[PDB]
Design a protein around this ligand. Structure first.
Ligand SMILES: O=C(Nc1cncc2ccccc12)[C@]1(O)CCOc2ccc(Cl)cc21
Ligand SMILES: O=C(Nc1cncc2ccccc12)[C@]1(O)CCOc2ccc(Cl)cc21
Lengths: 305, 302
């Protein structure tokens, strides 16, 4: 029993964290094979960050300008190239701790674990969701840039995020491991604002199934709804529309608990229109949306890595 | 900015997780140097359930009865001994991934990361607090026994918990790494009940300081209180009494935010009286008590 926000074991990723220094800027890099990946803004000064020409800045850099440190060993940079907003530093040594990995771009609503680092040293691991507005509600201080988001599939690390910046509202923006930002963000010191956030509906439903699996049933009701009627109500409360794909992925939980997806949707509909009435679900007074249907199955069935 | 429930990176602990099998029971062990630590209840059969005599059961076991598996390598048990509720299996190989470590017994309110394992394989990492009633509100299925709780301050792993059992209410009980249980619990299937849980008051205050550091100030008020008046109100909401030690540990946060401890205590009294009025503090509609004063400083200041 029990339900917790659970991150993937971070060991396979800790073996890849290195420190990258360029001039006065120090941030984190991901050392996979003979390449170190890090945000390209490591090459920026104060004037540069305001209106940067990264192609122009990188062309002026030499390999000896980048100081890469893996533990207490300096790695020698033998090449540099840029792929979108990520800088790729070719090193002479292949990381012997390189796990089986893949670079994956995730969709909003999907979850992943974040290994927060400072000076190439991992300090914390937390689980979070890629918000529908493409920000992550992370916990990052200055120096955390280059920290990565990942999932583990069997024994394969799927790298899906690299931290680049903090928006004025305290939320965070970053890119996939190919340098493409999630969201309408740019890596420059400029007025940027995250769009209005919405609730990840399929995740709330998955978390309601986790509550039923844990014996919390007070919110269940006799009612069912149509997917269209549910979406009309949910959109009114800033909830993401639920697609047929979401109903399908919720199938195993629906079969395990004996509560159809549209039956759980009628409970969610009532929870939205009437509130929780001083009651809690899994010790929470708010509907949780950072557990996907796969996360709930993985936790309530004990899948190991 | 931002505030999250954050676990320590689990890598240093993953390299120590092994699978221990005795008869039909399979659980997890912690392989440090040439010793594998695991709950002693791995030696229990269906008859040694309510009233097992572990000294008697262990004496009947031979080294070849314990099957230790580290990945796809069977480790050879060359000795066995019991220290309280933990079994120590001496193996013929020192774990090369053994980190710098220490065994630490924690107090209620202390937080730690849990590496939940099944069959010696880590499946997730989450963050816990030792509840004032000595249970932990974990997430564990059958087979999770032997999973460990830890803190990583600097290069050193402080092992503070080993999972042994699930109480009838879904909460969990375990021991430190010397086999001493936290709480009035025994490793028997006899009727056991956790005492009524209470909120870790010093941790809520630490979390309110984290919210102020993150710009959430709506709950602040012009009031201060005496420590005694605050404790009288808090106790009515099943909150732990706040001691002078707790006021002292909250000193740095009080200095950083400019809000005295007793001033924040008055804000906490008001929150207990009114509720949140549809507002959240750090994205939460309930007062969070699983962040210690030390966690808040580490996460907010660095
Ligand atoms: O956001 C940044 N860094 C941080 C990233 N995460 C969390 C933080 C928390 C506290 C301070 C800084 C943080 C910047 O390096 C600072 C200046 O503005 C930009 C603008 C664009 C870019 Cl791509 C980076 C940065
Ligand atoms: O609680 C146990 N195991 C579990 C431990 N964690 C989580 C679980 C979840 C679902 C079922 C079982 C769980 C026992 O091994 C069996 C039951 O009685 C006792 C009694 C005493 C002891 Cl020291 C262990 C156990």
């Amino acid at each position: 029993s029990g339900f917790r926000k659970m991150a993937f074991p971070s060991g396979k990723v800790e073996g890849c964290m290195v420190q990258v220094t360029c001039g006065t800027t120090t941030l984190n890099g991901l050392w996979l094979d003979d390449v170190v990946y890090c945000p390209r803004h490591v090459i920026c000064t104060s004037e540069d960050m305001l209106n940067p020409n990264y192609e122009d800045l990188l062309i002026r850099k030499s390999n000896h300008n980048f100081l890469v440190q893996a533990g207490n060993v300096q790695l020698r940079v033998i090449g540099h190239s840029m792929q979108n907003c990520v800088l790729k530093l070719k090193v002479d040594t292949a990381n012997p701790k390189t796990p089986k990995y893949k670079f994956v771009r995730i969709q909003p609503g999907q979850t992943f674990s974040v290994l927060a680092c400072y000076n190439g040293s991992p300090s914390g691991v937390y689980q979070c969701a890629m918000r529908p507005n493409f920000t992550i509600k992370g916990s990052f201080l200055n120096g955390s840039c280059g920290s990565v988001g990942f999932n583990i599939d069997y024994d394969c690390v799927s790298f899906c995020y690299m931290h680049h910046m903090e928006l004025p509202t305290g939320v965070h923006a970053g890119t996939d491991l190919e340098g493409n930002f999630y969201g309408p963000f740019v890596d420059r010191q400029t007025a940027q604002a995250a769009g209005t956030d919405t609730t990840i509906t399929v995740n709330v439903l998955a978390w309601l199934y986790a509550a039923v699996i844990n014996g919390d049933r007070w919110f269940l009701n006799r009612f069912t709804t149509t997917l269209n009627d549910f979406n009309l109500v949910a959109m009114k409360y800033n909830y993401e529309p639920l697609t047929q794909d979401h109903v399908d992925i919720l199938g195993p939980l629906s079969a395990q608990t004996g509560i159809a997806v549209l039956d759980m949707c009628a409970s969610l509909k009532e929870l939205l229109q009437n509130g929780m009435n001083g009651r809690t679900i899994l010790g929470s007074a708010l509907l949780e949306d950072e557990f996907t249907p796969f996360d709930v199955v993985r936790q309530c069935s004990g899948v190991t890595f």
